A and B are shown apart, each in its own frame.
With several copies, the nearest count.
Chain A
């Protein structure tokens, strides 16, 4: 089992479309009813859903937000009735310090909800977090929740889908501070999926609805095998151990109109495609640390071995000199059309990601020398006296970059 903590407008939407994808996959009706064709289903549902006496299924989700508008719109959707009104929380009434201050203020009810959800699962495995690191809501609230959660639950995993601000595009003027602080908290508490609007929209090209549909696709494909038990990799901890910051790529990212080219898609061509920098959805002979490829559809392990052999000989990849990939196979949901003969998802750890922080650090250093937009931060208690928090966070990020 698992819980999802989605914050800010970004996280709220991310959750909306993630649950849309999930209910589509598992044959869950918008109202929580189960379709007749899926009555005898074999798919495991406990992982993301828990059924109710009324036979309906409820997501293990909690909605958090500093503002009402987004969730109010969500509850006007056809999927509104599905969620649990008890879990959803809205502030009665764009800065990280303010977000963390509110988090300190509203500890009690949030952790009440979290405890209630936790006690309903026998074998909870970890946590899932969806949020954006730039905006005031996501950054600060996620920081506070991560801190108090790692404190509260020292034996549960914490996984996040953190969305990083666009850089080529000059959105949050105060983004460097929030990003740097959120990164501090991620290193200091997060167990383990980086995301950026820049490269994501780049691949989308070459509305937020479609972008986050792709993101939800990534999340669902990541959790597929856990959802669909097989032989190997039957747990999230198995995933994490096989890799341990990450980046992702998915081959069949094709529009509903781009099915006309039914290209004979082997496993070799897919696994190859997952390697190119173009497909890496995120934007010094930098090299890899780990690679995992989850493959959906018919697959012959002989083909997998041949592809691995050929790629190894062709040396299209580079590895650490000081240490000695993985190809897991799953089964598609029996419901969604198998427009793709075989499909592939890749999650990897690669040193080049360091550059991200070097940019943000460069951004942050490009402001701290002139004290820009610190007036609001001084208002909050945390930065009321000084900003030693900022210095510690910057040095922590520098240490991480040095370690990479």
Chain B
């Protein structure tokens, strides 16, 4: 009965669908303005290096589901996602002289492949399964568990919890190559670094826990 009167009438499920939608279109125009700060400037933009804490307002009938420590995890994945959209768009908006372009495809590929992995293979696989699960909610408690078994797993597949200084930092430091090379528009000293860190990336990730092989091809 409770789940029945909770689909509408304090529609907790409807609110949940919007949550994972207003981040993870609309949010494309929002970030592009940030590329070219102030704390009130953003609000009118939204209503239209690692910060931008985002929150939301939830009514009491759904407060018990989307807890306070649940907002931060949803915020955690949003921060990291933008840095990927950043590097992906920074190397995209533009269009031994031509030798730079060979450093573009050798790099614009790699960040693009990673982005194809986090969003499609993870942020859409578990998402497609989660919706098929909540539509069979039959309990006050288990709806928390099926939900809590969606964040604590999406925070693991997207490598952000542990093994950060062992694996995650590698993707982080090579992301700085997407910033340095973007501004300049020394060249030989980039591939010596790039061919090293990229090989450092594969020769470290080679330990593969098993789902990492979907990107290990490149």
Contacts and interface: CB of A to CB of B under 8 A. Distances in A.
Are any A and B Cβ atoms less than 8 Å apart in their complex? yes
Interface string B70-107: 00000000000000000011011111001001101110
A20 B149 CA distance: 48
A337 interface: no
B25 A242 contact: no
B29 interface: yes
A350 B93 CA distance: 23
Contact of B95 (A244, A305, A322): A244
A322 B95 CA distance: 21
A329 B119 CA distance: 12
Contacts of A403: 98
A382 to B, nearest CB: 28
A301 B119 CA distance: 11
B126 interface: no
Interface in B112-157: 112, 115-116, 119-121, 123-125
B106 A323 contact: yes
A234 B28 contact: yes
Please indicate which of the listed interface residues A238, A290, A329 has the most CB atoms of chain B within 10 Å of its own CB. A238
Contact of A232 (B98, B105, B119, B214): B119
Interface residues of B, number: 32
B120 A232 contact: yes
A237 interface: yes
B25 A241 contact: no
Contacts of A323: 102, 105-106
Interface in A277-317: 290, 301, 305, 309, 312
A30 interface: no
Contacts of A290: 105
A112 to B, nearest CB: 27
A342 to B, nearest CB: 16
B218 interface: yes
Contact of B28 (A229, A322, A326, A329): A229
B119 A231 contact: yes
Nearest to B112: A242
B108 interface: yes
A288 to B, nearest CB: 12
Given A234-B28, A242-B112, A301-B121, A324 B105 contact: yes
B109 interface: yes
A351 to B, nearest CB: 14
Contacts of B92: 235, 237-238, 240-242
B175 to A, nearest CB: 17
A241 B91 contact: yes
B206 to A, nearest CB: 18
B37 to A, nearest CB: 20
A258 B31 CA distance: 45
A309 B25 CA distance: 31
Nearest to B218: A324
A235 B102 contact: no
A373 B7 CA distance: 77
A305 B101 CA distance: 28
Nearest to B85: A234
Interface of A: 123, 157, 191, 229-232, 234-235, 237-238, 240-242, 244, 290, 301, 305, 309, 312, 322-324, 326, 329, 403
The 6 A-B residue pairs whose C-beta atoms are closest, nearest first, are A241-B92, A229-B25, A231-B119, A237-B92, A234-B28, A238-B92
Given A123-B29, A244-B95, A305-B214, 9 more contacts: A157-B95, A229-B25, A231-B123, A231-B124, A232-B120, A234-B28, A238-B88, A290-B105, A323-B105
28 contacts: A123-B29, A229-B25, A232-B115, A232-B116, A232-B119, A232-B120, A234-B25, A235-B89, A235-B92, A238-B88, A238-B89, A238-B92, A241-B92, A241-B94, A241-B104, A241-B108, A242-B92, A242-B112, A244-B95, A301-B120, A301-B121, A312-B217, A323-B105, A323-B106, A324-B106, A324-B110, A329-B120, A403-B98
